[PDB]
Design an enzyme around this catalytic site. Sequence first.
Site, PDB file in Angstrom:
ATOM      1  CG  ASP A 134      -0.796  -2.547 -34.871  1.00 47.54           C
ATOM      2  OD1 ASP A 134      -1.804  -2.887 -35.518  1.00 47.54           O
ATOM      3  OD2 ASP A 134      -0.633  -2.879 -33.681  1.00 47.54           O
ATOM      4  CB  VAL A 138      -0.842  -0.520  -4.003  1.00 47.78           C
ATOM      5  CG1 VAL A 138      -1.330  -1.557  -3.014  1.00 47.78           C
ATOM      6  CG2 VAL A 138      -0.104  -1.165  -5.181  1.00 47.78           C
ATOM      7  CE  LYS A 189     -10.071  -8.019  -4.850  1.00 44.15           C
ATOM      8  NZ  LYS A 189     -10.921  -7.164  -3.947  1.00 44.15           N
ATOM      9  NE  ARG A 194       8.510  -0.947 -23.707  1.00 40.09           N
ATOM     10  CZ  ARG A 194       7.412  -1.426 -24.279  1.00 40.09           C
ATOM     11  NH1 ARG A 194       6.781  -0.719 -25.210  1.00 40.09           N
ATOM     12  NH2 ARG A 194       6.949  -2.624 -23.923  1.00 40.09           N
ATOM     13  CE  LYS A 251      -3.986   2.183   2.162  1.00 44.18           C
ATOM     14  NZ  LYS A 251      -3.256   3.486   2.206  1.00 44.18           N
ATOM     15  N   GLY A 311       5.207  -8.735 -28.562  1.00 43.16           N
ATOM     16  CA  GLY A 311       3.872  -9.225 -28.860  1.00 43.16           C
ATOM     17  C   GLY A 311       3.530  -9.151 -30.338  1.00 43.16           C
ATOM     18  CB  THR A 371     -12.456 -10.667 -24.639  1.00 46.24           C
ATOM     19  OG1 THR A 371     -11.902 -11.347 -23.503  1.00 46.24           O
ATOM     20  CG2 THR A 371     -13.907 -10.300 -24.352  1.00 46.24           C
ATOM     21  CB  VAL A 419     -11.253 -13.795 -30.980  1.00 39.95           C
ATOM     22  CG1 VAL A 419     -11.258 -13.607 -32.487  1.00 39.95           C
ATOM     23  CG2 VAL A 419     -11.300 -15.254 -30.585  1.00 39.95           C
TER      24      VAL A 419
END
Length: 326
Positions: free
Chosen positions: A247, A56, A63, A174, A51, A180, A92, A94
């Site tokens: 992209d 946070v 949790k 980076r 925290k 990805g 989701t 796809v």
Amino acid sequence: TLNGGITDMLTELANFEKNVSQAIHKYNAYRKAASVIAKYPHKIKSGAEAKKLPGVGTKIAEKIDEFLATGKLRKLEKIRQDDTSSSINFLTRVSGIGPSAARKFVDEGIKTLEDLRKNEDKLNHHQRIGLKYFGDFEKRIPREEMLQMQDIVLNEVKKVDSEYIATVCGSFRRGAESSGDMDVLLTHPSFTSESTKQPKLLHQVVEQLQKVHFITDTLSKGETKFMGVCQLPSKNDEKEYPHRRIDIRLIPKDQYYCGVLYFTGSDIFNKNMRAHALEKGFTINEYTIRPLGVTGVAGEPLPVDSEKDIFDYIQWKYREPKDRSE
DNA sequence: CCGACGGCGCATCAGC
DNA sequence: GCTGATGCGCC
DNA sequence: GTCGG
Ligand SMILES: [Mn+2]
Ligand SMILES: [Mn+2]
Ligand SMILES: [Mn+2]
Ligand SMILES: [Mn+2]
Ligand code: NA
């Protein structure tokens, strides 16, 4: 990986809030906390310790306490067991199916990969391609393959016009060992903030990459942003490479530094940086950084001739691309 | 407590 | 056809 | 869900 159990938990909570709850601010809050915990350089021993980190709060701290005590979160264990939540979360994955379409599909009893494949007529073009390559798009791209893809794109672009400059951004810029997808920033001196002295600038580049069978499919396409599919060529008898997302973003050449700052990311870094700009009285987009007036209305674009200039305006020490992986 | 939370491109749709 | 709302996507 | 005012 130091606090990977916690950040995995928070990421799963973020996805639930985005995909199932359709609670976009909770999604953003969870990702922000997961990012700040991911860079924290200690093994977190309590929710109280977590925290202390900005992003946070009380609920995440509790949790975190449960997760360190038991190794799990009852809230997630119950979400995992809910058929509708689990179905929506799967659909989701796809490309082109979001939380709204996923809930609609589940409502009509389309809930699995097999269901999707037999109901292709119920998908728009983007969704049909996302389904076609579902498995391939789950794979990451090794940096070695990104280097091969860079060479093709940069060399093919030069063959259309030597005045194009293509820059690979995203995690590749980076310095990540895997990506990805491939994000390409494109410029051409004919397209500036002051004039578009030639049409079809992006089309011509897409058409060329289609001609040498690099680009294989199109998800969406406009005058400045292409979203599609590509694939490295394979040598004789070699298994094919996975199909990859690509992209391409064409940015006015005189606004390259704002554009490459945007497209280098990461996305959380951009959100953090643009939010801090607002706190400092600036607004940053992929084109410009502008002042905010007394009324909160954006002023004229400030002069920029380096990525670092943008950091200065908002009183941030410059951060190299490799330190923006938030 | 409350309002804000980054900013924008392309696809699809309803309404005119 | 146009516009604005919405969905989904990009970092 | 979190934060500054
Ligand atoms: Mn990417
Ligand atoms: Mn991408
Ligand atoms: Mn394939
Ligand atoms: Mn704020
Ligand atoms: Na999706």
